Design an enzyme around this catalytic site. Sequence first.
Site, short mmCIF file in Angstrom:
data_model
loop_
_atom_site.label_atom_id
_atom_site.label_comp_id
_atom_site.label_asym_id
_atom_site.label_seq_id
_atom_site.Cartn_x
_atom_site.Cartn_y
_atom_site.Cartn_z
CB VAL A 162 -20.96 -74.73 91.80
CG1 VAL A 162 -21.16 -73.97 93.10
CG2 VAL A 162 -19.62 -74.37 91.18
CG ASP A 163 -17.72 -79.21 93.68
OD1 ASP A 163 -18.18 -80.21 94.26
OD2 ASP A 163 -17.55 -79.14 92.44
CB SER A 164 -16.97 -74.88 98.74
OG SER A 164 -18.15 -75.40 99.34
#
Length: 82
Positions: free
Chosen positions: A39-41
């Site tokens: 996942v991305d921030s």
Amino acid sequence: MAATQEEIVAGLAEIVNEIAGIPVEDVKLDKSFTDDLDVDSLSMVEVVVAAEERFDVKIPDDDVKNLKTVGDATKYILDHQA
């Protein structure tokens, strides 16, 4: 409302599946959001904040990017749950 680990994990898992694709049963406090969840921030903060509020917990939006594992989130959600 106060939900325990598996309860909130189910609701969390269901929602992270919207972002990336960890199976609901694979969602563990030992797998990393950034690594395992892939996942991305921004991504994590988006639907996982949608996951926090659905149990009615209080955590800062940006704070989701601070937790490197899905489990770190859960326990923090479990500590700050209402």
